[PDB]
Amino acid sequence: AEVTQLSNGIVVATEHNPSAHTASVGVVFGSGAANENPYNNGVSNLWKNIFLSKENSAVAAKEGLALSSNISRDFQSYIVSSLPGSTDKSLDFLNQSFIQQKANLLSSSNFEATKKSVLKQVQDFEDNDHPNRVLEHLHSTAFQNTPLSLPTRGTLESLENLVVADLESFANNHFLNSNAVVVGTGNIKHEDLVNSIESKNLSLQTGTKPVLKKKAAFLGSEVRLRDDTLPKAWISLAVEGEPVNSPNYFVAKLAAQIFGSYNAFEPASRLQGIKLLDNIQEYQLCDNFNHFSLSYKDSGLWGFSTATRNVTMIDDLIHFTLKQWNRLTISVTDTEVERAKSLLKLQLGQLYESGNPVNDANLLGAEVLIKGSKLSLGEAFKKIDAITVKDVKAWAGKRLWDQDIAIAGTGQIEGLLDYMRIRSDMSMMRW
Amino acid sequence: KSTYRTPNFDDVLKENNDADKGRSYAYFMVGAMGLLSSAGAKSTVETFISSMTATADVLAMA
Amino acid sequence: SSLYKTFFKRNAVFVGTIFAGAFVFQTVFDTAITSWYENHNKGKLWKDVKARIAA
Amino acid sequence: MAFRKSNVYLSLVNSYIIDSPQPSSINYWWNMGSLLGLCLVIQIVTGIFMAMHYSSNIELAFSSVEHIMRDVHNGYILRYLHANGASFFFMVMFMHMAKGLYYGSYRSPRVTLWNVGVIIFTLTIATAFLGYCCVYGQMSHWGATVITNLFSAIPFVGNDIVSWLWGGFSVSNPTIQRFFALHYLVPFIIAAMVIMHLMALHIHGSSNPLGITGNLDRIPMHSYFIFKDLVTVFLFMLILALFVFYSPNTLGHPDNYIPGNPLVTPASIVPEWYLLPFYAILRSIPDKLLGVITMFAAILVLLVLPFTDRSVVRGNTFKVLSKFFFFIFVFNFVLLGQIGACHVEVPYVLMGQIATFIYFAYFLIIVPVISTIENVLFYIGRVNK
Amino acid sequence: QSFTSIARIGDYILKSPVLSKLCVPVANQFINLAGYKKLGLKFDDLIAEENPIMQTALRRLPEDESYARAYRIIRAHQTELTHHLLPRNEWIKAQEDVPYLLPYILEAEAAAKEKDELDNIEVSK
Ligand code: HEC
Ligand code: HEC
Ligand SMILES: COc1c(O)c(C)c(C/C=C(\C)CC/C=C(\C)CC/C=C(/C)CC/C=C(\C)CC/C=C(\C)CCC=C(C)C)c(O)c1OC
Ligand SMILES: CCCCCCCCCCCO[C@@H]1O[C@H](CO)[C@@H](O[C@H]2O[C@H](CO)[C@@H](O)[C@H](O)[C@H]2O)[C@H](O)[C@H]1O
Ligand SMILES: CCCCCCCC1=C(O)C(=O)c2scnc2C1=O
């Protein structure tokens, strides 16, 4: 449970955990899809794909190393996993690919074979992964004409028109030092890694900063992707949430836990202590749903997602759910808040502490990049337990009560009523 | 075209410097409509009811 | 309009405040009208004629 | 499908009168409903034809009814039909209501059905009364006076509501004319209410004498019950005929053949027979305000029955204690009526007071107590441990 | 009134030899005067079913009992409409008049009551 981080030339961050069996090293950049443009959208996803290409991947495999990378909105990360002993051979492969081979990975035979893969990849996504496709579109309309609206995997149109020069252009503007953090998780010590790094000098484009832009903003709107040939209806709905490093980051995350997630087929799920289940189970209004409090640097999204085959009662699904959310402003109970506290701790635990160093790396790098440090799991619990009913009520009265929303859906959505109908349910009549 | 590229709404959108601008106007409008409607309903109801009170020709003081 | 946000603060006007305002309006408006009306017809009314009479 | 099923208008008729699934075992007590519709029609038809010859002015009302009696061809048939029809309307309504009481028709899931029925009963009382005032006989005038004064019991504004209702200093020409206008209006509100009654009946269907489900054995309304309804419709007409032609004034009051007089109230006032039980209840309370409140409560208490019936089975068919007490309630009601026709004298006043007590106690004490006891008896008579 | 409540009172009386000898004979006389047995019905057949508890109960009832309940109810309606009673040798005997649905009704009520309790549990820190 130690968050160690020191700066010499490069800001090095590590979180050691003795019993681990393995160790992971890599760099995480403070720039992701939210830094691209509508036309070069998909560059970051492309980088990730070449970094994992058959050529580069075969080199580290001989050495007994494994590769992993993830593209997000605010950040990007390249990671190399290894045994606790080869904690040095990872640092060689890292520098070899980001300085020496930052021109060998971009050959006219590799880039074309990779481009052909992300194209079949992103296409496959839009053709079949409906729930994620919808959540991606939710960000698209909620933050339109603003950074957060750009899909992480990029659009098929900005992708097929992307050239090697664009990769370089992006890389030379974001893969800088002042916008980077070298992460090390697994078992290796902070002082073990920091030495192998402060050994090899060379700055490589120092003093350079990435370009700036215009702040992200929420806009009440919707995008309806009707498709009557699909067998279900997938919809996502949300209000403007909380950004990371916000006084209410936790109240919000707790508020989502109150309604939580559900799966109509799993017996135990049907028994949960969520009032909403009394309303939706009578006529079986949906196969599943899940609330969330997504947070980013400039903004966030608080809402839920759901999938259903009861295409003639979608208005009741949406109506009941939004009536429950009304309660957070006027009648949420102590026991509901308490049930949430326990469950939030359990999930926040399983995330920050799993048996996989790669997840730890991403989380560590991402956090240190936005707030210059990581909040310890124990420090979180103290904040979570401190939340009162009054807090939830004040938060909801600001974020949920009579506030614009964003909607997105695909499939048999004829039954999803108009905007103003849904919008009206964000409140209740009173004397 | 890509569904992620949201069409232009610039002509319709209000340059948000005052977020609660349209809300204040709409709510005032609805409120004034409710005010005048209630006054009218009250006057109409009173008009019908008072038509059942004693007529001018029967209030003779014997 | 910040003039609205001072009295109602981003919420609509409630029935009670509507009904209350309606009762106030009904009286104020009626006086304003009866006044303007009688002034416009000054000299033609019985009030005015009664003064010019002495019995 | 058949045309009767597909046509927008015919399907309504088909679902309510032709294909409606009825419990195979319902008895003749279930025939009162149709008889009530028939009564409603007879009242509306004969009323409109007489309205053609009636004058509402206080100086002409009484004589215009005499004009209907002496000059209008078949006029006396119209008046005696309308008048005797009102009485028959109540005889049948009480049986309809009593049938519901006995079989637990008021129980869930037919509460809405029962509540709408209470509203109809109130509207019917109001309608008959207004009609009664249109004759403008001696009873008419005083009835119009008493019932409108009932509102003065309300504190503060009460006497105002009254002078308002009268449209003047006393029951006069503005009163009787508004009463006629109102007597014509209300029957159409009853009709609309009767439709809502039927809508509520259609969602769960009729109950049956066994008090259990009818879902395992139903037979079509058409043929079986259409023809069974015909049996009582004709019997109903035969009896009404006997009064209309052979004894037209037996259910009326001689004082109504005397024009209303503002200065003289008859030495002996006996209201309409169907109002007597309520008249007795009113008279039994030596306080003005409490007197009218208790009378109105005698009607509203019908609303309480779905909650005070603690039983686990519907109806009194298989219940010894409940059947017995059901009849105490019935004859207590008749007694109240008999007391209402007597003078406020010694043995009667106390009898009236006790009967009133018993009436309310049935709903609030006897039913809940008895039904609980019966529940337990049913249990301990079969469980062996 | 719930069956849990009916059982509480009924069992208390049934155990105490004071009331058990005083009441049961009256109850037995009551049941015979009711006459439902002459129609081929068992008391449990008479319970009003239009509520969730009874619907759950009838749903859990094993197949063979269900077909039998059905035959008894239909047979009852037919006799009633003919204004007769079944021939005495067809009447339900006291040994047969068993509370077969009762165990399902009580189980459902407890399940229901628990849920009501759990949905409203307060918490003391
Ligand atoms: C205009 C249509 C009209 C309708 C609809 C109507 N009536 Fe009448 N009613 C009259 C007229 C006209 C009189 C006066 C003539 C008379 O005394 O019969 C009257 C008189 C009465 C009387 C006095 C009877 C008597 O002793 O003379 C009663 C009671 C009555 N109506 C009951 C009813 C009931 C109950 C209904 C309906 C369910 C009804 N009326 C519907 C017109 C109507
Ligand atoms: C205070 C109660 C009450 C009043 C008054 C009432 N009803 Fe009903 N009615 C019922 C109930 C309860 C039922 C259900 C009977 C059952 O299935 O056990 C019913 C059923 C019916 C039925 C179905 C057949 C039957 O008789 O059971 C008809 C038709 C009907 N009512 C017509 C009417 C009409 C027409 C009126 C009067 C204008 C009326 N009712 C007034 C309570 C009432
Ligand atoms: C589930 O169980 C049921 C059941 O559902 C039903 C429906 C019935 C059958 C009974 C009924 C349907 C009764 C229904 C009664 C009505 C709908 C009455 C509606 C009433 C009215 C008064 C209609 C209004 C009439 C008019 C406006 C016109 C009259 C005036 C005229 C014609 C004036 C003409 C003028 C000139 C100058 C010629 C049962 O017996 C039954 O038992 C088991
Ligand atoms: C026919 C006779 C006519 C009588 C008068 C007409 C009706 C007037 C009703 C007036 C006010 O009724 C009032 O409406 C506003 C909506 O505008 C309601 O407001 C509700 O919705 C608004 C809008 O999303 C929310 O901001 C608010 O927090 C919420 O309470 C308010 O709670 C209710 O009290
Ligand atoms: C449910 C309403 C019951 C009506 C009760 C009022 C009964 C009633 C009186 O109390 C009365 O003093 C006179 S004088 C002439 N008619 C009446 C009459 O009907």
- Angstrom distances, CA of residue D158 to CA of A160, B48, E79: 85, 20, 58
Question: In angstroms, rounded to a whole number, what is the distance separating the alpha carbons of residues C43 and A57?
Answer: 105
For residues A240 and A369, membership in a common domain is answered with yes
What is the C-alpha to C-alpha distance for residues E103 and E3, in angstroms, rounded to an integer?
10
CB A104 within 8 A of CB A56: no
The 3-state secondary structure of B19-56 reads CCCHHHHHHHHHHHHHHHHHHHHHHHHHHHHHHHCCCH
Q: Is D374 on the interface with E (CB under 8 A)?
A: yes
Please give the Cα distance from D359 to D368 (Å, whole number).
Answer: 14
* Length of chain C counted residue by residue: 55
| Calpha distance D212→D215 (Å, rounded) | 9
Q: In this structure, are strands A221-226 and A406-411 parallel, antiparallel, or unpaired?
A: parallel
| Residue contact E121–A335, C-beta within 8 A | yes
| Residue D204 marked in a binding site | no
Q: Provide DSSP, A19-75.
A: S-S-EEEEEEES--GGGS-TTTTTHHHHHHHHHTSHHHHHHHHHTT-EEEEEE-SS-
Cβ contacts of D346 within 8 Å, gap of 6 or more: none
Cβ separation D164–B52 shorter than 8 A: yes
- Across the interface, which of B2, B3, B6 has its CB nearest the CB of A144? B6
CB atoms within 10 A of CB E28: 15
Tokens of A272: 């949960």
User: Residue D363: beta bridge partners?
Assistant: none
Domain with residue E23: its CATH number is 1.10.1090.10
Please, are residues A226 and A410 in contact by the beta-carbon 8 Å criterion? yes
Give me the residue label for tokens 């009557």: A228
Angle at CA of residue D212, ends D207 and D214, nearest 5°: 60
- Name the residue type at position D213: T
Sheet containing strand A23-29, edge to edge, reads A4-7, A11-15, A180-185, A23-29, A76-82, A66-71
Do E76 and E40 contact (CB within 8 A), yes or no?
yes
Residues A372, A322 share a domain? yes
Same domain, A427 and A358: yes
d(CA E31, CA E96): 13
Overall residue count recorded for chain D in this entry: 385
Omega within 30 of 0 (cis) for the link into D262: no
Q: Alpha-carbon Rg of chain E, whole angstroms?
A: 18
Reported as half-sphere exposure (CB side, CA atoms, 13 A), residue D293 has a value of: 8
Chain B residues within 8 Å of chain D (Cβ atoms): 49, 52-55, 58
User: Which residues fall within 8 angstroms of residue D97, CB to CB, at 6 or more apart?
Assistant: D117, D121, D302
Residue A270 · residue A281 · CB < 8 Å: yes
Would you say D202 is a known binding-site residue?
Answer: yes
Q: Check the annotation: does D73 bind a ligand.
A: no
| Contacts with A430 from chain C: Cβ below 8 Å | 14
- What CATH number does the domain containing D189 carry? 1.20.810.10
Closest by CA to A90, choosing from A183, A201, A212, A169, is: A183
SS3 A15: strand
Which of A130, A146, A219, A224 should one mutate to test binding to chain B, selecting the residue with the greatest count of B CBs within 10 A?
A219
Range of the domain at E38: 1-125
Cβ–Cβ < 8 Å for E48, D312: yes
Measured CA distances, A249 to A213, A242, A246, A296, C34 (Å): 24, 6, 5, 10, 60
Report the CATH superfamily, name and number, of domain C1-55. Cytochrome b-c1 complex subunit 9 (1.20.5.260)
Q: Which residues face D137 on adjacent strands?
A: D259
**Catalytic position from the list D206, D284, D322, D371:** D206
Angle at A49 between CA A47 and CA A51, to 5 degrees: 70
Element (H, E) at D164: helix D158-166
Give the ligand with the smallest distance to the CA of D41: 3
Query: Is the same domain home to A233 and A108?
Result: no
Q: Name the nearest CA neighbour of E66 among E74, E58, E57.
A: E58
Question: Domain count of chain A?
Answer: 2
Q: Could you give phi then psi for residue A224, rounded to 5 degrees?
A: -110, 115
Across the interface, whether the CB atoms of A334 and E122 are under 8 A apart is answered: yes
Q: Provide the domain limits for residue D248.
A: 1-385
Task: Give the whole-angstrom CA distance, residue E34 versus residue D311.
Answer: 14
D53 is an annotated ligand-binding site residue? no
Residue that the structure tokens 């058409």 belong to: D222
Instruction: Determine D/C contact with 3+ CB pairs under 8 A as the test.
Output: no
Amino acid present at E12: Y
Cβ distance E50 to D108 less than 8 Å, yes or no, reads: yes
Interatomic CA distance for residues A407 and A422, integer angstroms = 9
B3/A156 touch (CB, cutoff 8 Å), yes or no: no
Report whether A292 contacts A306 (CB < 8 A).
no
With 0-12 / 13-18 / 19 or more C-beta atoms within 10 angstroms meaning exposed / middle / buried, residue D155 is exposed
Q: Report DSSP letters for A270-333, one per residue.
A: HTSS-THHHHHTTTT--SEEEEEEEE-SS-EEEEEEEEES-TT-HHHHHHHHHHHHHHHHHT--
> Are residues A322 and A302 in contact, defined by beta-carbon separation less than 8 angstroms?
no
C3, C7, C13, C19 alpha-carbon torsion, rounded to 10°: -110
Considering the domain architecture, whether residues A216 and A154 belong to the same structural domain is answered as no
Whether A168 and A228 map to the same domain: the answer is no
C-alpha neighbours within 13 Å on the C-beta side of residue C38: 10
What are A214's two structure tokens? 């215009």
Q: Which two tokens stand for residue A140?
A: 């698209």
Alpha helices in E44-101 (DSSP H): 52-60, 63-82
Q: Which residue has the tokens 């409540």?
A: E5
| D137 DSSP assignment | B
CB of A333 within 8 A of CB of E119? no
Alpha-carbon span A68 to A26, nearest angstrom: 9
Question: Considering only CA atoms, which of E45, E39, E43, E42 is closest in space to residue E86?
Answer: E39
Length of chain E counted residue by residue: 125
Token pair of D16 as six digits: 């309510």
B44 found inside a domain: yes
Alpha-carbon distance of A31 to A35, in angstroms, equals 6
The amino acid that residue D333 corresponds to is F
Chains in contact with D, where contact means 3 or more Cβ–Cβ distances below 8 Å, are: B, E
SS3 D265: coil
Q: Which residue puts its alpha carbon closest to atom 43 of ligand 1?
A: D47
Q: How many domains does chain E have?
A: 1
**Residue list, ligand 5 pocket, CB within 6 Å:** D 125, 139, 142-143, 146-147, 269, 271, 275, 278-279, 282
Please state whether beta strands A406-411 and D218-220 pair in parallel, antiparallel, or not at all (unpaired): unpaired
Domain definitions of chain C by residue range: 1-55
State phi, psi for A289 to the nearest 5 degrees. -160, 165
Pairing of strands A180-185, A11-15: parallel
Measured in degrees and rounded to the nearest 5, phi and psi for residue D256 equal: -85, 0
Q: What are phi and psi of A215, to 5 degrees?
A: -55, 140
The CA distance from A296 to D154, in Å, is 66
End-to-end CA distance of chain E: 36
Question: Does A429 contact ligand 4 (Cβ within 6 A)?
Answer: yes
Residue C13 is given by DSSP the state P
Distance separating alpha carbons of residues A214 and A205, to the nearest angstrom: 25
| CA gap D313, D50 in Å, rounded | 49
Is D228 among the residues known to form the active site? yes
Tell how far CA D347 is from the center of its chain: 29
If you search the block for the tokens 């409607």, which residue do you land on?
Answer: B37
* CA–CA distance, D85 with A74 (Å, rounded to integer): 85
Query: How many Å apart are CA B37 and CA C22, to the nearest integer?
Result: 8
Find the closest chain B residue to C6 by CA distance: B24
The Cα–Cα gap between D29 and A384 comes to: 67
For residue A139, what are the domain limits?
1-202
Task: Say which residue the tokens 């490093």 belong to.
Answer: A245
Token pair, residue A40, equals: 């070069």
Question: In whole angstroms, what is the distance from residue A325 CA to residue A417 CA?
Answer: 18
CA C36 to chain centre: 10
Tell the residue nearest (CA) to atom 33 of ligand 4: C14
Locate the ligand 5 atom nearest the alpha carbon of residue D141 and give its number.
15
Q: Closest-lying ligand to the alpha carbon of D221? A: 3
Separation of D318 CA from ligand 2 center, angstroms? Answer: 23
Buried b (16+ CB within 10 A) or exposed e, A366-377: bbbbbeeebeee
Closest residue in C to B18 (Cα) is C1
Nearest residue CA, atom 27 of ligand 1?
D83
SS (H, E, C) chain A: CCCEEEECCCEEEEECCCCCCCEEEEEEECCCHHHCCCCCCCHHHHHHHHHCCHHHHHHHHHCCCEEEEEECCCCEEEEEEECCCCCCHHHHHHHHHHHHCCCCCCCCCHHHHHHHHHHHHHHHHHHHCHHHHHHHHHHHHHCCCCHHHCCCCCCHHHHCCCCHHHHHHHHHHHCCCCCEEEEEECCCCHHHHHHHHHHCCCCCCCCCCCCCCCCCCCCCEEEEEECCCCCCEEEEEEEECCCCCCCCHHHHHHHHHHHCEEECCCHHHHCCCCCHHHHHCCCCCCCEEEEEEEECCCCEEEEEEEEECCCCCHHHHHHHHHHHHHHHHHCCCHHHHHHHHHHHHHHHHHHHCCCCHHHHHHHHHHHHHHHCCCCCHHHHHHHHHCCCHHHHHHHHHHHCCCCCCEEEEEECCCCCCCHHHHHHCCCCCCC
Torsion of CA C38, C40, C44, C48, to 10 degrees: 50
- CA–CA separation, B47 vs B25, rounded Å? 33
Distances (CA, A) of E93 to D104, D313, E42: 27, 21, 9
Q: Is D44 in the pocket of ligand 1 (CB under 6 A)?
A: yes
End-to-end CA distance of chain C: 60
3-class secondary structure, C39: helix
Q: Pairing relation of β-strands A180-185 and A300-308?
A: unpaired
Structure tokens at A86: 């080869």
Q: What are φ and ψ of residue A112, in 5° steps?
A: -75, -30
Task: Tell me the sheet residues that pair with A23.
Answer: A82
CA of D48 to the centre of ligand 1 (A): 9
CATH number of the domain within which A272 lies: 3.30.830.10
Q: Are A43 and A162 in contact (CB under 8 A)?
A: yes
Q: Cα–Cα distance between A142 and E40 in angstroms, integer? A: 68
Resolution (A): 2.5
Any ligand 3 atom below 6 A from CB of D278: no
Task: Name chain B contacts of C28, Cβ cutoff 8 Å.
Answer: none
Cβ proximity of D231 and D237 under 8 Å: no
Three-state DSSP at A238 gives: strand
Cα separation, D22 vs D19, in Å, equals: 9
Active site residue D5: no
- Give A246 to chain B, closest Cα distance, Å: 21
> Quick count: other Cβ atoms within 10 Å of Cβ D234?
10
Q: How far apart are CA D366 and CA D349, in angstroms?
A: 23
CB pairs under 8 A between A and C: 7
Which member of D105, D141, D207, D229 is catalytic?
A: D229
Domain count, chain D: 1
Question: B4 to chain A: which residues are within 8 Å by CB?
Answer: 136-137, 140, 149-151, 155
Task: Give the distance, in angstroms, between the CA of residue A40 and the centroid of all CA atoms in the same chain.
Answer: 21
Helix (H) or strand (E) holding A261: strand A261-263
Q: Does D380 contact E31 at a Cβ distance shorter than 8 Å? A: no
Buried b (16+ CB within 10 A) or exposed e, A286-304: bbbbbbbbbbbbbbbbbbb
Residues A48 and A144 occupy one common structural domain = yes
Record the tokens describing residue D102, joined without a space: 């006995």
> CB-hemisphere CA count at 13 Å for A376?
7
State CA C28 to chain mean position distance.
Answer: 3
The answer to whether A56 and A105 are in contact (CB under 8 A) is yes
| Three-state secondary-structure class, residue D218 | strand
Contact C11 A430 (CB under 8 A): no
Task: Say if residue A94 is exposed, middle or buried (CB neighbours under 10 Å; 0-12, 13-18, 19+).
Answer: buried
Query: Do D214 and D23 meet the contact criterion of CB atoms below 8 Å apart?
Result: yes
Q: Are A145 and B16 in contact (CB under 8 A)?
A: no
CB proximity A335 to E under 8 Å:
yes
Which amino acid is it at A164?
A: V
> CB atoms < 10 A from the CB of A431, how many?
7
| The pair of three-digit structure tokens given for residue A110, joined into one six-digit string | 């590799």
Q: Which residues, other chains included, contact A131 with Cβ-Cβ below 8 Å and sequence gap of 6+?
A: A234, A305, A307
Separation of alpha carbons A411 and A130, rounded Å: 9
The closest of D276, D281, D305, D302 to D293, measured between CA atoms, is: D281
Amino acid at A7: S
Based on its alpha-carbon atoms, the radius of gyration of chain B, rounded to whole angstroms, reads 26
Q: Is D206 designated active site?
A: yes
- For the four alpha carbons of A313, A319, A321 and A323, in that order, the dihedral sign comes to negative
Which residue of the set D202, D204, D288, D323 is catalytic?
D202
Closest by CA to A244, choosing from A194, A192, A301, is A301
Q: Return the bridge partners of A4, or none.
A: A14
Query: In 10 A of CB E53, how many CB atoms?
Result: 19
Q: Any idea what the CATH number is for the domain that residue B30 is in?
A: 1.20.5.270
Does residue B61 belong to any structural domain of this protein?
no
Residue-number span of the structural domain to which B47 is assigned: 1-55
Neighbours of D3 (CB within 10 A): 9
Residue linked to tokens 């149109």: A157
Residue D115 is which amino acid? Answer: N
Are E79 and E85 within 8 A, CB to CB?
yes
The tokens describing D173, both together, are 């020409």
Identify the burial level of B3 via C-beta atoms within 10 angstroms of its C-beta, where 0-12 means exposed, 13-18 middle and 19 or more buried.
middle
